[PDB]
From a paper:
The class B [name] are enzymes with the ability to hydrolyse virtually all β-lactam antibiotics, including carbapenems. Phylogenetically, [name] can be grouped into three subclasses, B1 to B3.2 While enzymes belonging to subclasses B1 and B3 carry two Zn(II) binding sites (Zn1 and Zn2), B2 [name] are mono-Zn(II) enzymes. In subclass B1, Zn1 is coordinated by three histidine residues (His/Gly116, His118 and His196), while the Zn2 binding site is coordinated by Asp120, Cys221 and His263.2,4–7 In B2 [name], the Zn1 binding site displays one altered residue (Asn116, His118 and His196), whereas the Zn2 site is identical to that of the subclass B1 [name]. Here, we investigated three of these B1 [name],6 [name]-1, [name]-1 and [name]-1, in comparison with the clinically widespread enzyme NDM-1.
[name]-1 was encoded on a tet(X)-harbouring plasmid in [name], a widely distributed bacterium in natural environments. The structures of [name]-1 and [name]-1 were successfully solved by X-ray crystallography to 2.17 and 1.33 Å, respectively. For [name]-1 we found two molecules (chains A and B) in the asymmetrical unit with Rwork and Rfree of 0.22 and 0.25 (space group P65). Due to lack of electron density in chain B, the regions of N60 to K66, L93 to I96 and K104 to S105 could not be built. In contrast to the complex H-bond network in NDM-1 involving Ser69, Asp84, Lys121 and Ser262, we found different amino acids in [name]-1 (Cys69, Cys121, Gly262), [name]-1 (Cys69, Cys121, Gly262) and [name]-1 (Ala69, Arg121, Gly262). Compared with Arg121 ([name]-1) and Lys121 (NDM-1), we found a third cysteine (Cys121) within the active site of [name]-1 and [name]-1. These cysteines (Cys69, Cys121, Cys221) were in the vicinity of Asp120 (3–5 Å). The lack of Lys121 or Arg121 in [name]-1 and [name]-1 was compensated for by an extensive network of water molecules. Interestingly, this loop was shortened by one residue at position 231 in both [name]-1 and [name]-1. For [name]-1, the catalytic activity tended to be higher and its carbapenemase activity reached up to ∼70% to that of NDM-1.
Residue numbers in the entry: 32 to 45, 47 to 100, 102 to 107, 109 to 131, 133 to 150, 165 to 205, 209 to 211, 215 to 228, ...
């Protein structure tokens, strides 16, 4: 089970295993309640890969400073899992620490369709990304359209860990925001994620409580 290793009004970090930490930050984009938004920190040999910026610059700086001063580590790469602001909201702060961004090509196109470009040159991938993190490996993979057309999934096999992002719901979630979604394909997409990760023990959805592969099952059935 999970240790809280950092907590503040702007940022919560939960330690789930020896290599896998969950970061939680809060979107306040309108005149209504803030919404909790999850990402994944993968740690190995004092090197860190982050799936999803926290929601803004100040939350992202709390995360970077936590990695530097408390995990005594370097962040070697940022992988935004799609183009919404619960994935790239703090991108400027990461770019200002010269953290390499790794992002899919469809994600770049949708960002550009929406008027945004990364400032620092990105490292781009079509469907699948393999990154070395010291002597272990971390992956991002595109399985199909869901929550958005570009959504990718993070995977660290050493701890059997999957960052579902917003393609994956928590147990008993509502459907949520569908403005950019492909509802005809969401569930077949997650069937593929399930097929690829039968031994997953840690599955982190984009919002709400993490758990096991039952998050896959629940999300498949939600959009059937
Ligand atoms: Mg696994
Ligand atoms: Zn989204
Ligand atoms: Zn989301």
């Amino acid at each position: 089970d999970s240790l809280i290793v950092y907590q503040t009004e702007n940022l919560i970090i939960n330690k789930l295993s020896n290599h896998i930490y969950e970061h939680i930050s809060f979107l306040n984009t309108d005149d209504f309640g803030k919404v909790a938004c999850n990402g994944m920190l993968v740690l190995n040999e004092n090197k860190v890969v982050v799936f999803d910026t926290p929601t803004d610059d100040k939350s992202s700086l709390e995360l970077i400073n936590f990695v530097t001063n408390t995990l005594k580590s370097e962040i070697i790469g940022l992988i935004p899992t799609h183009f919404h602001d619960d994935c790239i909201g703090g991108i400027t702060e990461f770019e200002n620490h010269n953290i390499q961004t790794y992002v899919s090509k469809e994600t770049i196109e949708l960002l550009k369709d929406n008027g945004q470009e990364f400032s620092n040159p990105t490292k781009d991938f079509d469907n699948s990304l393999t990154l070395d993190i010291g002597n272990k490996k971390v992956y991002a993979e595109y399985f199909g359209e869901g929550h958005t057309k570009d959504n990718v999934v993070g995977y660290f096999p050493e701890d059997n860990a999957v960052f579902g992002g917003c393609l994956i719901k928590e147990i008993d979630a509502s459907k949520g925001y569908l403005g950019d979604a492909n509802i005809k394909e969401w569930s077949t997409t997650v069937e593929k994620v399930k097929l690829k990760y039968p031994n997953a023990k840690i599955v982190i959805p984009g919002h709400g409580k993490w758990g096991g592969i039952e998050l896959f099952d629940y999300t498949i059935k939600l959009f059937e």
